[PDB]
């Protein structure tokens, strides 16, 4: 066998969601992760340098800022 299919193996995680994304080659299942280290309100993100992302990120962020 070459790929897995389904949840006969995987098992629930923390601060880790599976988003459906539109790849040039179809639907794909990229997983976003978040990690907590002591410090300042600053948030640094990895992967695609993304200036488009920060806007969104610091918004889901700026959401939890409120309804806490």
7 lies in the site for a second copy, by CB under 8 A: no
Q: Taking CB under 8 A as the rule, does residue 60 contact a second copy?
A: no
24 binds a second copy (CB under 8 A): no
- Is residue 19 within the footprint of a second copy (CB under 8 A)? no
Token reading at 31:
């997983």
What is the rounded CA–CA span in Å between residue 68 and residue 65? 7
Q: Which residues here bind a second copy, judged by CB under 8 A?
A: 9, 13-16, 33-38, 46-47, 55, 58-59, 62-63, 65-66, 68
């Amino acid at each position: 066998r070459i790929f897995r299919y389904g949840q006969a193996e995987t098992e629930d995680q923390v601060g880790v969601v599976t988003g459906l994304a539109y790849t040039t080659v179809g639907g794909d299942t990229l997983s976003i992760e978040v990690s907590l280290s002591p410090g300042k309100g600053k948030l640094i993100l990895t992967g695609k340098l993304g200036d488009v992302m920060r806007e969104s990120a610091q918004a889901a962020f700026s959401y939890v800022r409120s309804k806490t």
